[PDB]
Amino acid sequence: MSNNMQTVRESYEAFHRRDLPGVLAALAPDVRWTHPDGMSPYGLGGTKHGHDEVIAFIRHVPTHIAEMRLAPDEFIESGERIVVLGTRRVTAVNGRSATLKFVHVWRFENGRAVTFEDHFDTAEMIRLITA
Template sequence: MTITTCGPCPTQSANLALIRRAYDAFRTRDVGALLEALAPDVEWVHPDSMSDYDLGGTKHGHAGVKAFLAHAPTVVGGMLLEPLEFVESGDRVVVFGVRHVTSVSGRTEQLSFVHSWTLRDGRAARMEDVFDTAAFKRLIER
């Protein structure tokens, strides 16, 4: 098991490098680069309780991820992910971080997240997002 913080790491594994590239792509809104990190049949999983906003459940494949990313800005005014710690074990990378979420009314809050990435053949086959959905809902419903 390897634990690293968010700074550069010259000895990082291929899996860890891939996940860091995915976060960089998300930060720069480069959907093409993000999709390059994801397997074509990726499972993009968010808590079912976010289904009221069409953000919950499992999205399948690149089309599902693109649809999710296109829909999210209709629910939130903005979002920035700040990965803080990466834990790697075999084909799993778990990321602990903070998301800076801005509501459509302009209020921004920091909400913790845990992302569990499962890799297969050099690409992310599954990403599961775990977070406090009650806090997220309070922010976007204000």
């Protein structure tokens, strides 16, 4: 296993522990960390630049999402790029839950992620978290 693959796999372990430093450990200081623009009405869209902006996003997630458990199924590595596909179990602050899909794109430089992006069905995420 490549060091980058270990780093990706370890970031998912950090996430399930609610270990913010462990999640940041994979990311370059100049990271561009992106979520879909369709999530902007919830404050959960766009590109966060650097650790402080990533932390601010993470601290905002509980406003709408009470719990999220990732279940990665597939890790696809080529060069310094790793794509992870899976499902996630999400419980909204409104009390509803659903299983949704995700695709995460990671691009490394020197073993830290310079970009990260989450691609998913935003209409379905919004259907879950809205009133």
